[PDB]
Design a protein around this ligand. Sequence first.
Ligand SMILES: Cc1cc2nc3c(=O)[nH]c(=O)nc-3n(C[C@H](O)[C@H](O)[C@H](O)COP(=O)(O)OP(=O)(O)OC[C@H]3O[C@@H](n4cnc5c(N)ncnc54)[C@H](O)[C@@H]3O)c2cc1C
Length: 383
Amino acid sequence: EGRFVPGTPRHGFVEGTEGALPKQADVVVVGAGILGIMTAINLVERGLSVVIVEKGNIAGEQSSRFYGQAISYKMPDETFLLHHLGKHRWREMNAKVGIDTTYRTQGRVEVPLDEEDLVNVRKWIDERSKNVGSDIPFKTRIIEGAELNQRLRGATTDWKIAGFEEDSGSFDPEVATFVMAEYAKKMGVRIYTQCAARGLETQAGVISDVVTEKGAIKTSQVVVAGGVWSRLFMQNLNVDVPTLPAYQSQQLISGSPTAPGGNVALPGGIFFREQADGTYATSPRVIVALPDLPELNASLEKLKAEFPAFKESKLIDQWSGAMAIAPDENPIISEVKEYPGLVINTATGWGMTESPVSAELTADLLLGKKPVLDPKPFSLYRF
Ligand SMILES: Cc1cc2nc3c(=O)[nH]c(=O)nc-3n(C[C@H](O)[C@H](O)[C@H](O)COP(=O)(O)OP(=O)(O)OC[C@H]3O[C@@H](n4cnc5c(N)ncnc54)[C@H](O)[C@@H]3O)c2cc1C
């Protein structure tokens, strides 16, 4: 609510395409969150017409409710490159749109929980450094002393060591996906809001239509990017998508001239991230019952105790978001053997970060192209 500011770039509303639902589209995308939008953009670049159908408003669910960090820290081999390349593409994004998405290369310091955690993060960095798997330089390393002290300036606790993802990204949920949606519209993606996809029709084993509440659109190619609803949508087509719900709370507070900047993660559940306008995202837990109102207030109190720079900061907004996560915590970016011409791009807790690459992979899978990354760890049939 209060985090969105009407009549500014933080308005948080992009209108759907006007007029009647088109009779045909080369690809129909279900869902106008980041995954549907980014996939649509990728497909239009390949010369295909794209229509997105969205049951509510553009970017109305996970893709405007996120914490806002783009990180590869601790990612397993299955998703490391998805994140590493995702960040690299986010670093190109303001230049690609020519409008500020709020993406910033910010840097992130995470103090380990204990000696065991420090052993584990050191091994993780060492192993990745020995085989990055990309020519994009890796910029994560352990820091101490002056460099650490500068990143944690004004901290009450004498923190001694941290993992520093120097090129961690930041993006703000009041802006990023909305800028991407407007860009998609400018590129010719047509996006119909208040327009739920109900199902499909087929002819001779080929998709013929996406059936919406506003009528049918002719197509033989479908991307399911329905966020938490992807399981439900696929169940109506007799296909099981294993996801389970997860929930996370978020807060936004006003800035301070003495706040340290950056992205910080500390023992005692202290997490904050400076937004592009100098406000700060924070929460009692940012990586998966929701915290109650006393816990949320207490989270701000311990933030302020650790960083007195925030003592006079005002609570701008406080909200919660629903995710849907696969059993192994990795995305589902997959063909569906039951429906040739249909692909799924969903089931991720890191979709903002991953989206530029999962969009490409989704399109590759749809079109039968040599895929950008190994698709096996994202298959629907891995469980
Ligand atoms: C609280 C929270 C914090 C997060 N923090 C981060 C972070 O710091 N960094 C990061 O990278 N990621 C983060 N994530 C994850 C990221 O926000 C999601 O992975 C990503 O937004 C998912 O995008 P999506 O397009 O799949 O889903 P959504 O944005 O939820 O979009 C799916 C859309 O599909 C529509 N839809 C569903 N069914 C239908 C239908 N039948 N017909 C038409 N439309 C339909 C929905 O209305 C919705 O708009 C966070 C998520 C949450 C909830």
